[PDB]
């Protein structure tokens, strides 16, 4: 029962049980039909909160490990435990993306294609945040490949003010800055996206003005942080 699985995800969100919410939306996705915009957002919200809790915990432990011998080896083992959890979450999302979500996009559902390819870039980026060495280089390449595919579709088919195109530029630029340590590429991408969206800000309705200006504020804040 599809509608009941969606209600369960809504119920889990209110109960702040995001692992349950993700399990429900994973079940919806495995029904192998295209997700509605409502279902797509519930799936994204669920896994963002699931992986976000691990990312936050990892950053706390990683800072403790740096700022802090028998205690050090325990801190490193605990960080690896969190890494294994985070990597398992990303594995489930990336499998959903490659086996159901990207697959079930029609030839002209470009909005969903950009959304899911950006998501693919996001979750490989989260893998890269906790990887080192050759393993890191591999997921960094995968993240870049997904963002780049999303970018080419977004440039061809979406207008610069579209929130998904802007959000792709935001996260792609963060990838350049934080992961690739390429701040010039990051700055160029974020500035181009901001400037190209300025043109049609007067044309937006009250709702679209809010969503687009929100991401433009995040682009602007990043650019000032980087300079």
């Amino acid at each position: 029962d599809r509608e009941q699985l969606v209600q369960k995800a809504r119920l889990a969100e209110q109960a702040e049980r995001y692992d349950d919410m993700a399990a429900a939306m994973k079940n919806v996705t495995e029904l192998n039909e295209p997700l509605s915009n409502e279902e797509r957002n519930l799936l994204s919200v669920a896994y963002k909160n699931v992986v976000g809790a691990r990312r936050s915990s990892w950053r706390v432990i990683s800072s403790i490990e740096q700022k802090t011998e028998k205690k050090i080896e325990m801190v490193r083992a605990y960080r690896e435990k969190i890494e294994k959890e985070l990597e398992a979450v990303c594995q489930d999302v990336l499998s959903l993306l490659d086996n159901y979500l990207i697959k079930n996009c029609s030839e002209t559902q470009y909005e969903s294609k950009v959304f899911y390819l950006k998501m693919k870039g996001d979750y490989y980026r989260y893998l890269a945040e906790v990887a080192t060495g050759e393993k890191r280089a591999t997921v960094v390449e995968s993240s870049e490949k997904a963002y780049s595919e999303a970018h080419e579709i977004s440039k061809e088919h979406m207008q610069p003010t579209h929130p998904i195109r802007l959000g792709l530029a935001l996260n792609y630029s963060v990838f350049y800055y934080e992961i690739q340590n390429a701040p010039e590429q990051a700055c160029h991408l974020a500035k181009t996206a901001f400037d190209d969206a300025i043109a049609e800000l007067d044309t937006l309705n009250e709702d679209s003005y809010k969503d687009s200006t929100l991401i433009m504020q995040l682009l602007r804040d990043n650019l000032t942080l980087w300079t």
Partner: peptide, 6 residues
């Protein structure tokens, strides 16, 4: 850190 989509 830089901000991603929130």
């Amino acid at each position: 850190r830089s901000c991603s989509v929130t």
